[PDB]
Symmetry: C3
Subunit: 114 residues, 3 copies
């Protein structure tokens, strides 16, 4: 009498798991893009600071940022990398455990009538 609902609940759990797995894939691609851009923006900032210094040796608009800025940005994003890489590893683990629990639940649903 409740079997139908139970089956649909277990089914919905698979559906939600599928959604969050595919959301994790899209999040990973977004994280990749962010990393790729960070390296390219840092290169541009480095380039422009080098060109400003060369000009200075020679007017030419002083590269405004502070001396310390490259170090700071490097340290901040290294922290960012460590946090994001940990979260990606943890979510992968949690997703794997959810898949196992999904299988356990299906097994139990199948054992249900007999």
């Amino acid at each position: 009498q409740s079997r139908t609902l139970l089956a649909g609940i277990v089914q919905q759990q698979q559906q939600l798991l599928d959604v969050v797995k595919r959301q994790q894939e899209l999040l990973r691609l977004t994280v990749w893009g962010t990393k790729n851009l960070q390296t390219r923006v840092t290169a541009i900032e480095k380039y422009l600071k080098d060109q400003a210094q060369l000009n200075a040796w020679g007017t030419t608009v002083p590269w405004p940022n502070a001396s310390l800025t490259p170090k700071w940005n490097n340290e901040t994003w290294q922290e960012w990398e460590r946090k994001v890489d940990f979260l990606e590893e943890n979510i992968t683990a949690l997703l794997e455990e959810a898949q196992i629990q999904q299988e356990k639940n299906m097994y139990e649903l199948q054992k249900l009538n007999s």
Copy 2:
């Protein structure tokens, strides 16, 4: 009877809730990084325009407003999802008690 499957369903809901909490922390970090890059690219664009004008002597609006909108939206959603997650956790605790009664 169906108790064991039920236990397993309740547990998988906590597992799903845990994934989405972690995914929100990852998404917040990614949003931070987007913001940080947006500010740095804006700075670079401004610098290059300044330099161009100086050189020639011898866009920003639009972008700012569009990113203002983006910020409002992002910010709304971050708040909203945090509250939804906390509600989910509370309902999770209720479902665990009810299973308990079982």
Copy 3:
């Protein structure tokens, strides 16, 4: 009499679906931002390379002071192809997740239907 629990579980599935739908909206906005930045950084890279080459040329010939743009010749094409692929993948995922969310919504309604009948 597992009813209250079952209603609690169906309600929590609703809450989880609501969370993942809002998380997708946040993800879509983040993707948008990533794309906007990619377009602008690519524009900057192109401008700087062009400027560097034009200045190198004029200093050689002066025909109506710059640090050479260091990247390899082929980098912009490689960048473009890599992000075209990124885009293709992001687009697949956005279509797929939207489809999975609609399926989830359908199954939530079927579950609610069944919950309303078993207790009645």
